[PDB]
Design a protein around this ligand. Structure first.
Ligand SMILES: Nc1ncnc2c1ncn2[C@@H]1O[C@H](CSCC[C@H](N)C(=O)O)[C@@H](O)[C@H]1O
Ligand SMILES: Nc1ncnc2c1ncn2[C@@H]1O[C@H](CSCC[C@H](N)C(=O)O)[C@@H](O)[C@H]1O
Lengths: 225, 227
């Protein structure tokens, strides 16, 4: 199958089952990463190198005043990637108890989290002209093709000048594959690039994550604006 | 050959129980502690348990009630919080580790106000009140009882069931025999042994189901619904 419309039988249930699944996940790094908490550092260190080139290389350098963490969970990325690099961070996640745990997990530096938004991305509108970086990691599989394109268009309008959107997520070898366990899909590169294009975004950089276990989906980062 | 009963693998019953009590006393009161480092599989487990259980809550001549459940070996209340409290008006918990029951008060949150009794007792010494529970949930703790104590506990659970009540066992199953884990001081039994014990307790199987989507390296997990 080549689209979510071909693999999702019931859209209302696709979303309701996903919300149920994460409501039942322990609010921990290993819970966020499906038992691969031990590779969080490998992930974060690679993301930081990917991101830092946009924050330090001009002309038209990306700014560091505010970032948005989408599907942020308990704040694994907010804690170790975003808060050290941005003066303020907003978080949005559908699971309220993860945002509650984030207040504890993030500690003293979490005081610089400006907004905690409890909302599904498909229902979320980031404020216009607000974010230098919008980070979307391991959650795009929870939106339909159409809702993903529409959300990315809203994100584009929330970027400050020189801002970027970063997508980091699992990529399927071919087609669009439904995971009936957590109620998410995985898409191949051509599908994702097509959705990015439909949202009016340009691809600035693309990089495959190295040093991951051989058994898991390949992971790619895309920088967009 | 393969061993067929705990009386072939347990050298000293008093020490089998005392070692287990000491082991759990030093486990963190967290979902990852409850699940032996596999905390991330909790939602897979809860979704399967709910689908398994809801079959028996359907309207009909044998419909299981929703007034009260008992969570056996409940730990901090992972199952009470995610599975049982949403479906039953009240829930009782029983566990040998006091500080898990203390932590439960925090872990369960506002809905924890509907937890009625917190029993701090080994299952082998616990006698639930007759005619009190619609569902008795026994998950990942049967390996901590001897064959004789498990059969007897199931007999006492049978007496505590309301009309149309059920007992659910969900636990690790060995491919063959009875295998001792001398770290946490528990056994893992094969399906034939477990079925033998269930039958000796005067219980019968309504349903039996293997748990899907688990990591390949761990013991297989089965659910049994009993009355
Ligand atoms: N429709 C949706 N909208 C917003 N968040 C969603 C969502 N569906 C699932 N989620 C959230 O997406 C997260 C996936 S786990 C990944 C967590 C985080 N991005 C990290 O890398 O550490 C969970 O926190 C879950 O609550
Ligand atoms: N003899 C015994 N009687 C009652 N509880 C016991 C016991 N031996 C061990 N336990 C308890 O059994 C639990 C095993 S961990 C499983 C916890 C819970 N059933 C869940 O699935 O989330 C621990 O909480 C431990 O304290």
């Amino acid at each position: 199958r080549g689209s979510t419309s071909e693999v999702i039988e019931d859209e209302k249930q696709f979303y309701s089952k996903a919300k149920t699944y994460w409501k039942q996940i322990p609010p921990t790094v290993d819970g966020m990463l499906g038992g691969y908490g031990h590779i969080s550092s490998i992930d974060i260190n690679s993301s930081r190198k990917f991101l830092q080139r946009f924050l330090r290389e001009g002309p038209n350098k990306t700014g560091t005043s505010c970032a948005l963490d989408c599907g942020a969970g308990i704040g694994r990325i907010t804690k170790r990637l975003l808060l050290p690099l941005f003066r303020e961070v907003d978080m949005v996640d559908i699971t309220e108890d993860f945002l509650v745990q984030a207040k504890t997990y993030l500690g003293e530096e979490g005081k610089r989290v400006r907004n905690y938004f409890c909302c599904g991305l498909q229902d979320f509108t980031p404020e216009p002209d607000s974010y230098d970086v919008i980070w979307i990691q391991w959650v795009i599989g929870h939106l339909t093709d159409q809702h993903l394109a529409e959300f990315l268009r809203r994100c584009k309008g929330s970027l400050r000048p020189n801002g970027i959107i970063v997508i980091k997520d699992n990529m399927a070898q071919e087609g669009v594959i439904l995971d009936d366990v957590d109620s998410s899909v995985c898409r191949d590169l051509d599908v994702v690039r097509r959705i990015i294009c439909s949202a009016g975004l340009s691809l600035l950089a693309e990089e495959r994550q190295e040093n991951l276990p051989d058994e898991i989906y390949h992971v790619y980062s895309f920088a967009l604006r």
